[PDB]
């Protein structure tokens, strides 16, 4: 014992648990969730079937109304309108819209993709060429619906719904220590270590860390990219928020007024999420430690301007990972392993099935012990099994899935960059 100076080891980082996702404790593997989709057009399950309700699409304002009697001409690239008539178009976003023509004009003959057509139509709308319109059906038509008085081809529009579902499956993970007797004995003689228990700790720890890290990555993987579309400033850099570029800060200088610009965008992204999910404004953010340092140093309340030290929210990743609540509104977590600099926002409801992302544990941290008689060295390890999944409707773009059944597990096709509950923001310039 030549003046032993004690010893060191690394600390274990904390986790965000499942604070921002579903937890679905399971008592069996492979559970299932189903859903009802209000639908109309006399066949709940069909190509082209239309959903009665959707966060991103307007309703068919003339479905029970005049559209019952007549079809409306569709808008299409290169066609010319007739003043006073009404044209129909289903937009990629904002859905069914009926537009009365105030003028006789053409629409972007050079348009190709629907996105280009939608853009010109939007311009014609702004221009006052095309105006939103709806009306009920002339009563003289309604009078004979269902073939009265010798009439024909006059059914009422019908509605119903389609129930379908998705299922999940649990994947697992296991690790062993495979250690030796002699090492454990020496450790007992050096620090008084058990050298099995420490390993048990390490293995269990690693498993838990991986799972939690996996959830965060799935959040990032499925989240839509923000500062885009409906939340985009047209002169911006598309998905990334800077401090070195006046476009994102409305010309700000003077950090006391500049930093608030981010808070503004955060609200916009949180609101759009509600627009995407139909449930509510995002209520949680996870972000790089650099982002949080900024948040904690700016007065996030409404005031003239203000700057100081980063004391507003815990900023460490050594005690916790939970920084605090932003404005008293969003739960702020720190992405202690962020690859660059950024921040994801999202919404999780009181209903465990209302989360977008779900974790559903079935088996966890089962210890295993024994020894191999060939050399009698010990073997120890741990096993976990759970499975994760995604919300039906998380994509939101589609009103319904193929074949009335799908995996509820994430995949590229199922959710990469699609999840209505979360949005990504890249951050630079801090």
């Amino acid at each position: 014992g030549p003046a032993v100076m004690g010893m060191v080891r690394r600390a274990i980082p904390n986790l965000i648990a499942f604070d921002i996702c579903g937890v679905q404790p399971m008592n069996s593997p492979t559970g299932q969730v189903f859903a009802l989709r209000a639908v109309y057009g006399k066949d709940p399950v069909a190509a082209g079937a239309k959903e009665a309700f959707h966060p991103m699409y307007g309703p068919d304002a003339m479905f029970s109304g005049q559209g019952a009697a007549k079809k409306f001409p569709a808008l299409a690239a290169s066609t010319q309108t007739t003043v006073g008539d009404i044209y129909t178009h289903f937009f990629q976003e904002t859905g069914t819209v009926y537009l009365q023509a105030s003028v006789q004009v053409t629409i972007d003959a050079g348009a190709t993709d629907a996105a280009k057509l939608d853009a010109e139509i939007k311009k014609q709308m702004e221009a006052g060429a095309l105006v939103e319109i709806a009306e009920g059906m002339a009563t003289s038509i309604a009078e004979l619906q269902e073939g009265f008085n010798g009439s024909t081809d006059n059914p009422w529009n019908e509605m119903g719904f389609r129930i379908d579902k998705q299922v999940i499956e649990a994947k697992s993970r296991q690790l062993k220590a495979a250690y030796s007797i002699e090492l454990a004995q020496d450790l007992r003689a050096v620090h008084g270590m058990d050298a099995d228990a420490e390993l048990s700790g390490i293995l269990a720890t690693e498993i838990m860390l991986e799972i939690n890290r996996e959830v965060v990555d799935w959040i990032n993987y499925s989240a839509q990219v923000g500062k885009s579309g409906m939340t985009l400033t047209p002169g911006s850099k598309a998905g990334v928020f800077d401090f070195q570029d006046p476009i994102d800060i409305r010309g700000a200088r003077w950090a006391g007024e500049s930093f608030k610009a981010l808070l503004f965008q955060i609200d916009k992204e949180a609101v759009e999420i509600a627009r995407q999910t139909g449930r509510g404004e995002g209520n949680f953010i996870i972000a790089s430690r650099n982002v949080v340092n900024v948040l904690a140093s700016v007065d996030t309340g409404i005031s003239y301007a203000a700057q100081g030290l980063a004391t507003g929210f815990s900023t460490d990743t050594t005690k916790s990972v939970f920084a605090g609540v932003l404005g008293g509104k969003y739960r702020v977590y720190i992405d202690q392993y962020a690859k660059q600099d950024y921040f994801t926002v999202g919404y999780k409801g009181p209903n465990e099935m209302d989360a977008g992302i779900y974790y559903a544990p079935y088996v966890a941290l089962t210890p295993l012990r024994g020894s191999d008689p060939k050399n009698f060295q010990p073997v120890m390890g741990f096993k976990t099994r759970y499975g994760i999944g995604i919300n039906p409707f998380a994509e939101s773009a589609a009103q319904a899935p193929a074949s009335r059944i799908q995996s509820g597990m994430p995949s590229i096709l199922n959710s990469l960059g699609k999840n209505a509950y979360f949005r990504r923001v890249y951050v630079k310039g801090i």
Partner: protein, 496 residues
């Protein structure tokens, strides 16, 4: 109840769930260490628990069993191993005998509601329920055994039952749980900024998990089997508040005696072998047979071996020497021939089972042990040890008593006679009294009175001068003023 696990116990689950929620509602917060004084093992869970269903409970048990209760099981077996010996079991007998008194034409442990309650009707209902608990346990005949086991293993447990078809009147006979099979825990259902100090209803559940697949003792063909998670409300239990330096690994009073119990056993056996060994004669022959292979030398060795061997035994069934007729020669004539030229062949004797004692250490240790078993030194009038044991026993009774208070409130509350709030305010005093040995009680009281009489007698000549008779009754006879008036009034009646 997230899942209806073991629906068999749903009524108990309801009771625990109710209590858990009521505890959460109450501000049982701002507490640094888990609010656990004594009893079952502690374990921590995450904020919002994140540690369910029962499979998580099994994680708790493994961690709490592998390095934990497995030791507890050894201790239970140890107490039995301790009691299996004499000079041990009798201490227990003395304790049990003093702890529960059984006498003819009198009562047994009984509920005594002599302090304020809502009404005599309620009191009568409580007294009937108490009686049924005893009836369920056949306590008046088997109470000694119930107590003995409690004391010896430092813990008693009984499974409670609800119908459940008409659960209102659901308590029926209690069932003792098999020792070593069940672990109890209290989980901290909370987490904050590194070190929660807030409310948790702590679960208060337990798991049974033994198997005869691995024996502590053979001849057993039944056990708990797999891991069965049952709510605390389901059971009745008690133990002494005796634990090790850490954890909740409960021990008994008799633990203190384990050391000397074995030191004595060890010395007793050592003494026996010390004296038994070498009691017979003992001799080694050395034969000078060289220049021969064993196949030849063996003949010469047998020549001597089958001639010099006194092929007899002592018949310990009947004190005789086998084939020794007549009973004893006046001499045993032996002979040997030598082959070399020197007196080397011979037979040595070994020293024999002589007596070197001074057999006193064993006595010292036995005395230390007897004392260690929690006994008076008056054993192999009224004195301090007897008074001390009366106190030891009332504490053992006081703790043991929960065995009745628990099923008593349980069935009273289940039926609805009293409410939970009332129970908590009422006790305080819902005490259960144990009978006291009338023989010795009379003797104690008689000596007290004799002293009181003698002091009164001494005071007598000064009563009309310095010590009023009221005062003498108050200080010498230790009477209250009401008692003094009562005696004066009764005397007036006697005189008429």
């Amino acid at each position: 109840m997230k899942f209806n696990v073991l629906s068999l116990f749903a009524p108990w689950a309801k009771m625990d769930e109710r209590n858990f929620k009521d505890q959460e509602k109450e501000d049982l917060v701002s507490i640094t260490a888990p609010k656990l004084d004594d009893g079952a093992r502690e374990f921590e869970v995450s904020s919002n628990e994140a540690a369910s269903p029962y499979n998580a409970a099994f994680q708790t048990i493994f961690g709490s069993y592998e390095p934990g209760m497995k030791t507890t099981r050894e201790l239970i077996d140890t107490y039995r191993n301790l009691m299996n010996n004499y000079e041990v079991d009798n201490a227990v007998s003395e304790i049990v005998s003093d702890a529960i008194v059984y006498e003819d034409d009198t009562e047994v442990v009984a509920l005594n509601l002599d302090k304020s309650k809502f009404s005599p009707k309620i009191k009568n209902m409580m007294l009937d329920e108490f009686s049924d608990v005893l009836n369920h346990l056949s306590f008046q005949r088997k109470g000694s055994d119930h107590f003995r086991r409690w004391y010896v293993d430092s813990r008693i447990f009984f499974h409670k039952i609800i119908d459940p078809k008409r659960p209102k009147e659901g308590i029926k006979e209690l069932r003792r749980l098999d020792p070593r099979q069940v672990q109890y825990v209290r989980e901290i259902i909370t987490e904050t900024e590194a070190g929660t100090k807030i409310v948790k209803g702590y679960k208060e559940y337990f798991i049974y998990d033994t198997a005869h697949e691995s024996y502590a003792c053979d001849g057993r063909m039944y056990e708990a089997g797999t891991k069965i998670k049952i709510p605390k409300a389901a059971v009745v239990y008690a133990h002494s508040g005796l634990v090790d330096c850490c954890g909740k690994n409960i021990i008994g009073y008799l633990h203190r005696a384990v050391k000397p119990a074995n030191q004595l056993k060890l010395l007793e056996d050592a003494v026996v072998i010390y004296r038994i060994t070498r009691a017979p004669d003992r001799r080694v022959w050395y034969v000078d047979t060289g220049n021969m292979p064993a196949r030849k030398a063996a003949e010469h060795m047998q020549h001597v071996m089958n001639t010099m061997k006194n092929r007899v035994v002592y018949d310990a069934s009947t004190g005789k020497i086998k084939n020794q007729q007549h009973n004893m020669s006046m001499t045993e004539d032996y002979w040997l021939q030598r082959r070399d030229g020197k007196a080397v062949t011979e037979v040595d004797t070994l020293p024999g089972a002589d007596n070197t004692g001074n057999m006193e250490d064993i006595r010292w240790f036995r005395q230390a042990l007897y004392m260690a078993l929690r006994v008076p030194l008056s054993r192999i009038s009224i004195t301090r040890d007897e008074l001390t044991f009366a106190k030891f026993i009332r504490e053992l009774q006081h703790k043991f008593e929960e065995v009745f208070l628990d099923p008593l409130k349980t069935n009273l509350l289940l039926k609805g006679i009293i409410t939970e709030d009332e129970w908590n305010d009422e006790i305080n005093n819902i005490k259960i009294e144990f009978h006291r040995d009338s023989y010795f009680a009379e003797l104690k009281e008689a000596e007290i009175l004799e002293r009181r009489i003698n002091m009164l007698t001494m005071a007598e000549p000064f009563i009309g001068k310095y010590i009023s008779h009221r005062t003498a009754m108050k200080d010498i006879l230790q009477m209250t003023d009401e008692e003094i008036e009562q005696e004066a009034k009764q005397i007036e009646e006697e005189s008429k």
